[PDB]
């Protein structure tokens, strides 16, 4: 209920329909900025953040108390400020804005481990954190084949699945 559906297909290209009917994307062929406070009157669909493991995040009064509108109020936001999470919350986030663009955030880049420099769902080049809206945010990764992997973030053993070309 706390997901923000402010979607708007003003070019009639068909993306917003893909949110509801998956796997129908037409291939034919085909860094991140610091997280923060995003106006939910901008985001379309589930917002995800990656620990690297993925988790949906909800709307919120800037005071921090969760706000249960559907991005309706401008007093309704996604609070996303992150810290690299052995200790913190999540490496980075990704979502779709109102006119259909994939947006992402994360901690600042930089021996080049995910635990030290990871800024979202990207991990290594080619391998990407799989999640039930990957084909929607990163659609060109439809050929990517999805292996079971495990990673350690400063000692913690994590099980997840990575889509890779």
């Amino acid at each position, epitope marked *: 209920n706390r997901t923000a559906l*402010n*979607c708007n297909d*003003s070019l009639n*290209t*068909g993306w*917003l*329909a893909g949110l509801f009917y998956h796997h129908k994307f*037409d291939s034919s062929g085909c860094p991140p900025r610091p997280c923060g406070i995003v106006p939910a009157k901008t985001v379309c669909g589930p917002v995800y953040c990656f620990t690297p493991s993925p988790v949906v995040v909800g709307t919120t009064d800037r005071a921090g108390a969760p706000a249960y509108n559907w991005g*309706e109020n401008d007093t309704d936001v996604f609070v996303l400020n992150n810290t690299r999470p052995p200790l913190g919350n999540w490496f980075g986030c990704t979502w779709m804005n109102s006119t259909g663009f994939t947006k992402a955030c994360g901690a600042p880049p930089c021996e080049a481990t995910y635990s030290r420099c990871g800024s979202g769902p990207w991990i290594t080049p080619r391998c990407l954190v799989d999640y039930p809206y990957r084909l929607w945010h990163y659609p060109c990764t439809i050929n990517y084949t999805v292996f079971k992997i495990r990673m350690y973030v400063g000692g913690v053993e994590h099980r997840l699945e990575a889509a890779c070309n």
Partner: antibody, heavy 125, light 108 residues
Framework: QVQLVQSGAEVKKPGSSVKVSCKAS????????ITWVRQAPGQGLEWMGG???????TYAQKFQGRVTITADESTSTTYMELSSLRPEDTAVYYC???????????????????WGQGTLVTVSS | DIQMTQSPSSLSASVGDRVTITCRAG??????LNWYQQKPGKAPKVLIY???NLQSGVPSRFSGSGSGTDFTLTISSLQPEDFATYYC?????????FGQGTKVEIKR
């Protein structure tokens, strides 16, 4: 910018059937939400059916048992066929994308954009 | 079924008038209603979607309003481009139903 172009005008015999195509192009999916609407000469609009991108058809009761909407995703065109042709079926037949294109306040909205160029189907003996 | 009935059936107005078309819904159709303009020898073009939102392009003279069952397309200053037949269309249901249209013509 999705765009639809339709079959040429077929001319059919009472009791026979007719299959109109509607090829899609210029978008981001392999199949769209396609709607079929007919308009009789001089008369008004009469909705007939629709196919979802997962090919889940829903028809108007006026033509249940008569109209079948199918899809050939490979060539990304959808088909509409209306059996048991009476002359009272002679009309223009359009397609359109009935696409979900705007959500706000936690509900989504559909409308018909764009429309095919229409196909005239004339049913007479 | 789910029956849209428009009024008036037709209408004749002088350039610059204020035209008021009414769609009534058989059932509480919530907010899901559309307005199409069609002029002759062309297919319909959308005009207002979700009861009150003007399609990009559509001049500001056109105003949609209403919810529940009583909807209203209005033209504030009937310009000459604007003579055509206006249909409404429901969308609470998946069986779409169309209004009967109201043809606007020019008083003379």
């Amino acid at each position: 910018q999705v765009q639809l172009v339709q079959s040429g005008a077929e001319v059919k015999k009472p009791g026979s059937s007719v299959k109109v195509s509607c090829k899609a192009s210029g978008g981001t999916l392999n199949s769209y939400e396609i709607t079929w609407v007919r308009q009789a000469p001089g008369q008004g609009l009469e909705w007939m059916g629709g196919i979802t991108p997962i090919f889940e058809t829903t028809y108007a009761q006026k033509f249940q048992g008569r109209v079948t909407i199918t899809a050939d995703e490979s060539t990304s065109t959808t088909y509409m066929e209306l059996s048991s042709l009476r002359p009272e079926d002679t009309a223009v037949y359009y397609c359109a994308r009935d696409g979900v294109r705007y959500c706000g306040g936690g509900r989504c909205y559909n409308w018909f954009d764009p429309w095919g160029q229409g196909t005239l189907v004339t049913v007479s003996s | 079924d789910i029956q849209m009935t428009q009024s008036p059936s037709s209408l004749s107005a002088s350039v610059g008038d204020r035209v008021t078309i009414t769609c009534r819904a058989g059932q509480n159709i919530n907010n899901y209603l559309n307005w199409y303009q069609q002029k002759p020898g062309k297919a319909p073009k959308v005009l207002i979607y979700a009861a009150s939102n003007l399609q990009s392009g559509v001049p500001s003279r056109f105003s949609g309003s209403g919810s529940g069952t009583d909807f209203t397309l209005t033209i504030s200053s009937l310009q000459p481009e604007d003579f055509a037949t206006y249909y409404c269309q429901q969308s609470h249901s998946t069986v779409r139903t169309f209004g009967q249209g109201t043809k606007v013509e020019i008083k003379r």
